[PDB]
């Protein structure tokens, strides 16, 4: 089946991501970023307080249903 992940915005908006455990989280970052209308290099994704790479998967990070991912912004100096 699909694993329902959750994204918690810094404003309060909740985004539910319906993806599979074999499905790379890379598309997750891009999909959300596309909706924001910005470069993926401007934001940062964190899971369990650790930054996520473009080579990680839900089944690789031992993620479960309702797992929330944090989305921050990079410092512009």
């Amino acid at each position: 089946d699909h694993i329902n992940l959750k994204v918690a915005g810094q404003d309060g908006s909740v985004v539910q991501f319906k993806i599979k455990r074999h499905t790379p989280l890379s598309k997750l970052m891009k999909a959300y970023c596309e909706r924001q209308g910005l470069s993926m290099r401007q934001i940062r994704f964190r899971f369990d307080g650790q930054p996520i790479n473009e080579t990680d998967t839900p089944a690789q990070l031992e993620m479960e249903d309702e797992d929330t991912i944090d989305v921050f912004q990079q410092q512009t100096g």
């Binding site: 908006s13 909740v14 319906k18 074999h22 997750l28």
Partner: peptide, 12 residues
């Protein structure tokens, strides 16, 4: 409030 639903499919 605001709720967003995104579904991504991967093909291999």
């Amino acid at each position: 409030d605001t709720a967003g639903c995104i579904v991504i499919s991967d093909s291999e």
